[PDB]
Each structure stands twice: as C-alpha cells, then as structure tokens.
Amino acid sequence: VPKLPCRVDGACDATIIKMMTDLNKKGIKVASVGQNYLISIPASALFADQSPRLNWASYSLLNEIAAFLKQFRKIAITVTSYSSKYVSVKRERALTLARSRVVSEYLWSQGVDSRIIFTQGLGSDKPITSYTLGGDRSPNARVEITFRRAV
Amino acid sequence: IIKTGDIMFAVLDTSVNSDEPGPILATIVTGKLKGSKLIGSFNLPSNADKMVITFNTMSIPGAEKTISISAYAIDPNTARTALASRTNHHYLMRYGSLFASSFLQGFGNAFQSANTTSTLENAVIGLATVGKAWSQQAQQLFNTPTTVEVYSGTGLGILFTQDVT
Amino acid sequence: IIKTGDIMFAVLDTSVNSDEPGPILATIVTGKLKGSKLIGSFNLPSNADKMVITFNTMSIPGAEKTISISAYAIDPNTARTALASRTNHHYLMRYGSLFASSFLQGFGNAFQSANTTSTLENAVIGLATVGKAWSQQAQQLFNTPTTVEVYSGTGLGILFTQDVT
Amino acid sequence: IIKTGDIMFAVLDTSVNSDEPGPILATIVTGKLKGSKLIGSFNLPSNADKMVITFNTMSIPGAEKTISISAYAIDPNTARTALASRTNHHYLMRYGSLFASSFLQGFGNAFQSANTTSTLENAVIGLATVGKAWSQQAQQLFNTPTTVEVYSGTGLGILFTQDVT
Amino acid sequence: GDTGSLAGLQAMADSKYTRAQKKQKMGKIREMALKETALSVGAQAGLAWRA
Amino acid sequence: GDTGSLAGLQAMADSKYTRAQKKQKMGKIREMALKETALSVGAQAGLAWRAKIIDEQLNKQARNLDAIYDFNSLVLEHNILPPVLLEGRNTLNLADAQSIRISDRTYKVAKQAHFITTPPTWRQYLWMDYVKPEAPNVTLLPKTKAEKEIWCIYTERGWKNGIDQANTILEENIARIKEDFGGMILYRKLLAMNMVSPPYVSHTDLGVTGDGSEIHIDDRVLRITALPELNVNSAEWRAAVAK
Amino acid sequence: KETALSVGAQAGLAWRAKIIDEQLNKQARNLDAIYDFNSLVLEHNILPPVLLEGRNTLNLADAQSIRISDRTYKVAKQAHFITTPPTWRQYLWMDYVKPEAPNVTLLPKTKAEKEIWCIYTERGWKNGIDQANTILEENIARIKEDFGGMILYRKLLAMNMVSPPYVSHTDLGVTGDGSEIHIDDRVLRITALPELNVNSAEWRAAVAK
Amino acid sequence: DGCCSKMGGINYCDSSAGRLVCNNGFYSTCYCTRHAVMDLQFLMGCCLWHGGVYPQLNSSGLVVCNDGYVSEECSLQK
Numbered sequence A: 001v002p003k004l005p006c007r008v009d010g011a012c013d014a015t016i017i018k019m020m021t022d023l024n025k026k027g028i029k030v031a032s033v034g035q036n037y038l039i040s041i042p043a044s045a046l047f048a049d050q051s052p053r054l055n056w057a058s059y060s061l062l063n064e065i066a067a068f069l070k071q072f073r074k075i076a077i078t079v080t081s082y083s084s085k086y087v088s089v090k091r092e093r094a095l096t097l098a099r100s101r102v103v104s105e106y107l108w109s110q111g112v113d114s115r116i117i118f119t120q121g122l123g124s125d126k127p128i129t130s131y132t133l134g135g136d137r138s139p140n141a142r143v144e145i146t147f148r149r150a151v
Numbered sequence B, C, D: 001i002i003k004t005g006d007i008m009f010a011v012l013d014t015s016v017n018s019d020e021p022g023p024i025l026a027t028i029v030t031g032k033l034k035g036s037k038l039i040g041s042f043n044l045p046s047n048a049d050k051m052v053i054t055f056n057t058m059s060i061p062g063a064e065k066t067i068s069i070s071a072y073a074i075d076p077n078t079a080r081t082a083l084a085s086r087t088n089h090h091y092l093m094r095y096g097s098l099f100a101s102s103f104l105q106g107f108g109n110a111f112q113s114a115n116t117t118s119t120l121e122n123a124v125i126g127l128a129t130v131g132k133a134w135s136q137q138a139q140q141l142f143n144t145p146t147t148v149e150v151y152s153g154t155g156l157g158i159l160f161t162q163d164v165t
Numbered sequence E: 001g002d003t004g005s006l007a008g009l010q011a012m013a014d015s016k017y018t019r020a021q022k023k024q025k026m027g028k029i030r031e032m033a034l035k036e037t038a039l040s041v042g043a044q045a046g047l048a049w050r051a
Numbered sequence F: 001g002d003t004g005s006l007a008g009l010q011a012m013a014d015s016k017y018t019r020a021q022k023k024q025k026m027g028k029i030r031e032m033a034l035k036e037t038a039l040s041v042g043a044q045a046g047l048a049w050r051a052k053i054i055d056e057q058l059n060k061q062a063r064n065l066d067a068i069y070d071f072n073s074l075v076l077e078h079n080i081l082p083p084v085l086l087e088g089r090n091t092l093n094l095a096d097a098q099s100i101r102i103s104d105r106t107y108k109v110a111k112q113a114h115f116i117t118t119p120p121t122w123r124q125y126l127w128m129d130y131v132k133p134e135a136p137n138v139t140l141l142p143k144t145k146a147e148k149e150i151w152c153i154y155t156e157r158g159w160k161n162g163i164d165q166a167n168t169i170l171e172e173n174i175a176r177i178k179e180d181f182g183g184m185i186l187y188r189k190l191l192a193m194n195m196v197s198p199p200y201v202s203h204t205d206l207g208v209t210g211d212g213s214e215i216h217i218d219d220r221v222l223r224i225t226a227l228p229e230l231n232v233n234s235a236e237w238r239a240a241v242a243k
Numbered sequence G: 001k002e003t004a005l006s007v008g009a010q011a012g013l014a015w016r017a018k019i020i021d022e023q024l025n026k027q028a029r030n031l032d033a034i035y036d037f038n039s040l041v042l043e044h045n046i047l048p049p050v051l052l053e054g055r056n057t058l059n060l061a062d063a064q065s066i067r068i069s070d071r072t073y074k075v076a077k078q079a080h081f082i083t084t085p086p087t088w089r090q091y092l093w094m095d096y097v098k099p100e101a102p103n104v105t106l107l108p109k110t111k112a113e114k115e116i117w118c119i120y121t122e123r124g125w126k127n128g129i130d131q132a133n134t135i136l137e138e139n140i141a142r143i144k145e146d147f148g149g150m151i152l153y154r155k156l157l158a159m160n161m162v163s164p165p166y167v168s169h170t171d172l173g174v175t176g177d178g179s180e181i182h183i184d185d186r187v188l189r190i191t192a193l194p195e196l197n198v199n200s201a202e203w204r205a206a207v208a209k
Numbered sequence H: 001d002g003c004c005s006k007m008g009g010i011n012y013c014d015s016s017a018g019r020l021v022c023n024n025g026f027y028s029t030c031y032c033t034r035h036a037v038m039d040l041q042f043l044m045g046c047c048l049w050h051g052g053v054y055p056q057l058n059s060s061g062l063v064v065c066n067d068g069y070v071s072e073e074c075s076l077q078k
Helices: A013-026 A058-071 A090-109 B092-113 B119-141 C092-113 C119-141 D092-113 D119-141 E005-012 E016-030 E032-050 F005-012 F016-029 F031-060 F062-068 F145-193 G002-026 G029-034 G111-158
Strands: A029-033 A036-042 A051-054 A076-082 A116-121 A142-148 B007-012 B024-028 B037-042 B053-059 B071-074 B155-160 C007-012 C024-028 C037-042 C053-060 C065-067 C155-159 D007-012 D024-028 D036-042 D053-060 D065-067 D155-159 F085-096 F099-109 F200-206 F219-226 G051-062 G065-075 G167-172 G180-182 G185-190 H010-014 H019-022
Touching: A013 A029, A013 A058, A051 A090, A058 A090, A076 A090, A090 A116, A090 A142, B092 B119, B092 C092, B092 C119, B119 C119, B155 E016, C007 F031, C024 C053, C092 C119, C092 D092, C092 D119, C119 D119, D024 D053, D092 D119, E005 E016, E005 F031, E005 F145, E016 E032, F005 F016, F005 G002, F005 G111, F016 F031, F031 F062, F031 F145, F085 F145, G002 G111, G051 G111
Parallel strands: A076 A116
Antiparallel strands: A029 A036, A036 A142, A076 A142, B007 B024, B007 B155, B024 B037, B037 B053, B053 B071, B071 B155, C007 C024, C007 C155, C024 C037, C037 C053, C053 C065, D007 D024, D007 D155, D024 D036, D036 D053, D053 D065, F085 F099, F099 G180, F099 G185, F200 F219, G051 G065, G167 G185, H010 H019
C-alpha cells in the first residue's frame, strides 16, 4: 500500500456519481452507454444570441465540467457544435466552428488529461427535433462533448 | 546420513528404578529408521532434580549391523530432560525415625532427672535406653538418597550427538 | 567472512536448570547465516548474578560443514550478561530450618534449666533432644546453591569469538 | 602510523558487572580509523575506587585484518580513570546481618543470665540459640566485596600503548 | 482449523491450541505401537479363519 | 522525523525520545524474526488452498478442455505426432558496433516428429498438483497483542503471495500448452502451403516365422525415414488468396 | 559532535535531492522538446559523432617554447550504431535514497550541547544542499557538452569539412538447413568512420544576409 | 476504503483489465494487481539508469553501479 497507488490519483467513484446526478438534475444531458460517454449542453445557457461570445456566469459551469472531466482516464476527446438556421449555411457553420474553437481552447487551458482533442461544427445540418418553433432556445442548437473511456 | 543434532522419537516399554545399572531398550517408531531398537543405561545426578538416560547401542534390522550411536532422551510434552518419577521417596521416613529416637532420649533423660524435685520409671527406662542406639543407627542410615524409577509405557524424544553414514 | 567478534541474533527453544550439564540447541534467525543450528552446554558461576551458555558446535545445513565457532548469549535490550532466571530459590528454606532447629535446642534446654527457679517437661524433652540432630544436619546441608533455570522461549544475542569464511 | 601514546575517542554500547570476565566490544567513531571496533575484557580490582577495561583485539574494516593494539578507557570529559557507577552495593546488608545475629546471641544469653536477679523465656530461647548459627554464617559470608558495573550508554576515551599501521 | 486457514491461524495465535496439543501429544506418542500390534494379530486371525 | 528534518533533529535533541527508544529497541532485536514464520505459514496455506480451488474449477470445465485441445483430430495417417514449428517476424540483431543482421521472417523446428501410442491430453499439462499439508508447526508464538496483529497481517501477506505464485504457475503451464498447439497447427498450415516435406514411412513384411516352439503368423515392421524438414528451394512454393 | 554534522549533511542532501527531482519532473515536455536526439540521428539509425572546438590556442612549455594557433577541432567519440535514441533522465535525474537510520550514539544532555548540536545540524544541512547543487551543475554541464558536440558535428558536416560515414549492406536470400530458415538475410556494416578532411581546397564557406 | 462506494458494491476483479467491477456495471477507480496500467512518474532507489547497485561489498562508503560509474549521492562521504 505505501509502495503502490491503490487507485487513480484524485479519483472517487462516489464523487463521480454524485456530480453526474447533480449535472443531470441541473439540466445538462449526460449519457454513459458502454464505455463511451457523451455530454450535451444547450446553446442558450452558454452563449449569447447567435454570438460567438461567452456569458460570464458560464465560467462556473465550465469549471464544473472540468472537475467532472478530471476523474476519468481519457485519450481522445471530440467537441461538436450545432445551431439553427439563421442567415445562410456558411454563417452558421462558421459560428459553430468558432464556438468549438473557444470551448476547446478553454478546456485545454484547464487541466484536461487527454492526448488528442478534436473540434468541429456543423451549423444546423443535423436536426434532432421537429419542433423548431423557438430560435436559440431550441434544443437542436447545442454543443456535444464525447469520448470513449479506455481501460 | 543423520543430520548433526536432529530429533527423532521412540517408545520406552521396559521400566526400572534408578538403583542398579541395567540394559534399557527403546524402539524408534518414526522417521527413516523404522523397526530399529536401541539399548543403553542410565545415570544418577547429584540431586533428584532430574533423571536422564544414555543410549549407545543401536541395532537396525534389514542387514546384520550393529551401530554405536550415542544419544540422550528428552521428555515429550516437557521439553526437559527430567524423568516422570517421584522424588519424595525417603524424606519423612528418616525424618520421623531420627526425631522419634531423639524424643525417646529426651523423655528418658528428663523424666529421670526430674525425679528428685513404677510405670513412670519404666517409661523413663524404655525411652532413655532405646533412644541412643536407634539414634545412632538412624544417623548412619540418614544418608540414603531418594531414587527415581522410569515408567513402562512412556514415549521419548531423542536428540543426536554424532552422525552416521 | 565473519567480522572479528561481531553481533548476530538467534532463538533458543529448549530449556534446562543450572544443575545438570547436557546438550542444548538453538537456531540463528537472521544475518548472513540462515537456518543454522548450534549445540553446546552451560557454565555455573560462583555468584548467581549472571548466567551464560557455552555454544560451540555450529552446523549450517545445506552443505555438510561444521565450523567450530564458540559463542555465548547476551541478554536482549540489556547489553549485559544477566540471564532470565531467579536467584533467591533456596535461602528461606535453609534459614528457617536452621533457626527452628536452634529454637528447639534452646527451648528444651532453657525450660529444663528454669525448673528450679509434666507436659512442660515433655515439651522440654522433645525440643531439647530433636533440636540437636536437626541443627547438625542443617549445618551439613546449609551450602546448597540457589540454582537458576533458563527459559524455553527466549531469543538471544550472540557475540562471535573467531572468524570464518 | 599512529603516535606513541596518543588520544582517541570511542563509543561504548554494551555494559557488564565486574563479576564475570567476558568478551566486550566498543566502536571507534572518530579519527582516521572510521567504523572500527575493538574487543577485549576487563579487570577486577581489590579496591572499589576505580574500574577499567582491557581492549586489545582491534577489528578494522577495509581489510580483514585484526591488529591487537591494547588500550584502556578513561572517564569522558573528566580526564580521570574512575568508573561512573555505584560502589555501596553490599556494605549495609552484611553489616546488618552480622549485627542482628550478634544482638540475638546477646539477647538470649543475657536475659537467661539475669533470670535470678514463659514468653520471655521463649524469647531467651530463640535469641540465644539461633544467634550463634546466624553469626557464624554471617561471618563466613561477610567477606563479600561491593561490585562495580559499567553502563551501556556512555562514550569513552582511549589512550594508545603501541604504534600500528 | 487448517481448512479455513486464515481463521485457523487467527485462532491459533492464542495459546489455547497450545494447551490443547500439550495433552494430545502424550497420547499421539503413546498409542502408536498398539495400531501395528492390532493390525498384525487381526491379519493373522482373519487369514486363518478365512482359510 | 526527517520531513522537516532540521526540526525533527531539534526535537530529538531532548532525551525523552531516547527514553522512548529504550523500550522499542527490543523489537528490532527480538521481534524481527516472527515475520518470517508468519510469511512462511501464510505462503504455504494460501498456495495449498488456491491450488485446491483452481483444481476444482478446472475440473468443472472438463468438456471444453478436450473439446478444444483434441489432439486426436491432428494425428497423421500412421499415428504420427506432427512436429512443432516456431515463426518469428521482423528479425533484427545488433551483434556489436558496425554489425546489424536483419530478416523478415524466420522459422525453427522445435520438437521433431516422433511416433505416438495414445494422443496426449491437457491433464498432463494443466493439472495443478495438490497435496493437503496438515502440519502447522510453530516455534515462537506471539505474547503481546501488537505482535499478534503483525503476525496476522504478515500471514495475510503470505496468503496473497501464495495466491500470486499459484496464478503464475498456471499462467506458465497455459503458455506452454498454447505453444505446443500453435506449433502443431502451424506445421499443418505450412505443410499445406508446401514449404516443408511431409514425413515418409516405409515398411517390410515377413510371413510365418519362428521355430517349432515360438511362432508368429505375420511380422510387419514400420520405420519412418524422412523426418519433415523445410525446402530451401523456393520457386515451387505456393501462395494463397481469399475473398 | 561530528555526528551532528554527518546527519545534518546526509538529511539536507537527501531533502534537496528530492526537491530537485520533483522540480525536474514538473517540466517534462519542454525538456525533451529541447533535447531531442532523433532529429540529429541520421538515416541509418546511426548516432552522429561528437566534435569539440577551441579557439585562440596558445601553449607555453618552458623557457623558449611557445606554440600558437587559431582553432583546434577534436573528435571525441566515433559514431556507432544505436537502436533507440537516448534521453535526459540518465544525464540529469540523480539517484535518491531515504536515510532513515539516525543512531543515538552521542545525545545532547547539556543545554550548550543541544545548542551546538542545533548549529552543527544547520551547517551540515547547508553543506549538503550545496553539494547537491554542485552535483546538478555537473550533470547539466556534461549533457550540454554532449549536445553541443552533436550540434558542432552537424554544422561541420553541413559546411562540408567532414566525411559522412559510408555504409554497405549485403543482401542474401533464404538461408539455413531444412530445420532453421531465414527468409531474407541482410547484413549492415559501416566502414568509413567519419573524420575531418585535411585539405582546405574542398572547403566551402557561407555568408548570411 | 470503499472502492464501490455509493454504488451497488464490489463484485470481483477482472484480472485481464486489472480492475474491479461494481454491481453497477462501472469500473471502480481501485486496482487489483501490478499487472495493470498505472502511471509512474517518480520512484525511489539509487544507481538508477545504470547497471544498478553492484552486489559486491565495499568497506568504504563508496557504492558503484554495475556500469562502473560511482554515485557519491548513494554513497556516504565525510
């Protein structure tokens, strides 16, 4: 015991499950199927009205995301951005690209213990709900972060 | 080949007192040597605080052989060389004999002396006159030691002294 | 290669009293030598303030070798030669026996003397006459040493005397 | 190369009473010779005003060589030869035993003598008769000297006697 | 005892097993030859009767 | 202590800690031997118990064992045990300075093909040996609760070590049988590939024979001569394809 | 007395060694990102040799003995084969042990003894720290020297003043008997040990902008 | 203490993964054996990155690694 670590450093399964429950009841979607994990966040609670900029209060949420991401031993990370149809295709794709870039940059700045990070956006080309009444409040406008836990 | 200073077990069947030398035999019942037997004799220490056995003549079956390994015995469940016997054999005997002889002497002399200041005289007679010879004989015999005697059904453990081929 | 007079540690298992010489065996527990056994005997000092063991026959198993390193035991955590035993075993017995024999002598003679200045005379009889033989036998036996006994579950520290290879 | 009769310091780790000579060891901690040990014995003086240690067999590592430069010990930081220990071990015991035995003799004899001019008679009995044997045994054992004993946790100073290399 | 070895050793840490074997070694060394003697006599008698 | 070792030595300057050391000096001298006994007994007991358990578990799966290592389904037409082949890929050796030797593939014959009487079985290989030991002999016994506890924990350590040792032995055996089976199947594949020469067996026959007291009706002798071996000639080697 | 000095020195040395080791481990990526060796490693997995340069050489031997030159170049170690490129741990990561055996030989009883014990502890601690720093400096100097030699060899070969090693490979088909075979034998040998040319006619210079 | 705390509870260990499995089908953070993927960045011992401590006994404080280099740091020096 005083010669080898009994567990991954700073890892607590009780903490993991508790924060998972807290995030899910907060409203950010979290799914763990098999050895692959996916997390979804609505656009409005993170960005401005179709604007590549960050609301200040969202930094606490980003900190919580980083705290959750610290625990797992991860190799590759993927972040994708999606939005609604506003002006064109190019404009929306550029907006998603910028959002992915900024979120990836901040995550890498934070202590993410991964080796590879991929970032991309796809505008409004992959709708997930027929109900598109609202604008940025629509669920389809979102950001996804996915990976597979290894060993 | 027997390791220098190892321990085996055997069984003692022939009982005898620690009074006269005699052949005492045990039979090895464990280890490599099976069916082998061992003849030896005993000794007497200065006091009755223990009793140990010297075993020298080992006879092993199979071939016509007779080895002369010398070893001693240690009491199982004791881890001591003492032998299961009794040591209070002849204490009270000589104690009472000597004390009674002295008491006779005293009674005779004192009740003869206290006459100035028939059966009483006869008691004086017996006690006084039979005190002396009995007392000196008791003093002569007082040096008899207390003996010990081995039992006829007690096992034994044996540590070895010199090796064999 | 053993240093000139170095310190090792062993464990002793078989016990005996300081009364009768015999083979005693122990085993080294640590250091370079492992599994080594050691046979020897004891010695008796004039003063019972210490007790040590003569250990000479060192046999290390594996290879058929028997070096002649003679060593002793030093009491653990005392760095001294005092042994785990008692020293007041046979003072009170002889003191009381001698004093009581003397008291009997005195009682008989004094209560005979005080007659000028039946059962009382009988008390005179018994004490006066049985005090004397008891007193002389007590003087005879007064020199019995207060023996000590080693214990059967104590380890030991060993200081070596000669070098080996 | 060492001067003829120079100074050195050593650390003493083991103790013993001045009762039984035996092997003893110390460690030189400073000077050119580092990690070296020194084994020897002690002496018994007629007077208890000092106590010294004989240290000759020097075991120095580096090479398995054993020089035998003989040396003694002095009181650390005192530049004196006496031993830091106790010397009043067995004065009072023998004094009291002797005086008590004498008092018993005197009490019995004098209280018997003054009878002309039963419990008191019994006291006379006991004192007069048990005083003598106690007195003679106490005179026999009165010649016991008071011992000295070093301690196992004090450093020592060593003066050289012969040169070595 | 020796089956659930961990529990058996935890128990044998105490000296109750020592005091138990103290008396049992007496019989274990005492009764040995009786077995062989009984075996021999039974073998002889049974062989003769069966024959 | 040695963490703020300056402060540790400053605290140790006071002699009450030396007084505390005066009593615990005993354990370093006397108690340091009980651990070996505890380790030994724990190792023995754990090894034996694990061996029994693994033997029972292995027996639980009898059918699959032969079902997979059916050697009898690999014997040749004259009751011949096929030989064993070993293959290495991307061989490289650095002999010394200015000396490199490389090759792509290499092959070695490990066990030459010989005759057989009955096909081998896994029980020869993977049957762990079990004998129950029932002789717990202890010389020194703990007398204080502390040394009792350390005896218990060291016993647990020995238990763990015995379990690990048994697992290691099983791993070695299973590796060995894997090696043998892989060699045989590789030999079959290579012989199909036409890189080795199939073994050759001849025979001789004698009719009725013997004296007027001992007779045999027919006496036939079978001897193999061409031990299988690689064919260094390469042009005739045949490759394969899939879909 | 001197025991306090010894124990303070040992403890301080060990403590400083642990501190410096953890500090070194704190920065990993920068370290090897700096001291890459594969980039220098040539095409045949051969470690380039080591070159040392000195300038303005003047030597006096005795009364009337003066020798003077501009530059001198020395070949330190010849190029040799290598499977995996080296690293920096073996050059900088110093060993470490935990001294856990302070023996109670000389223990302070007098208050002045305790005071001098404290001061000797302090000075031994400082001395051990200094020794550890010297050890680190030595390691850094050695590794820097080796790397600089590598760089100098690269620059000289670029300037075309040394002969790049010439390597011969002999290729053979299948080998061995019908029991042991190697499909495609190949032997790699290096013969032309790199060395500096002695004729300046071939020397070509460069000029920045 | 509790590897599967706030979960279903400890079931057993997958040795091949070298990891424990809770009742809920999630790998716990704990470990089973040395034959598992740890992360090692610091370690003890001396004569590292060398031939290791030479088994021979040097009476002096010097200790030499089997490659021939001498490490005063592992050695003791006056």
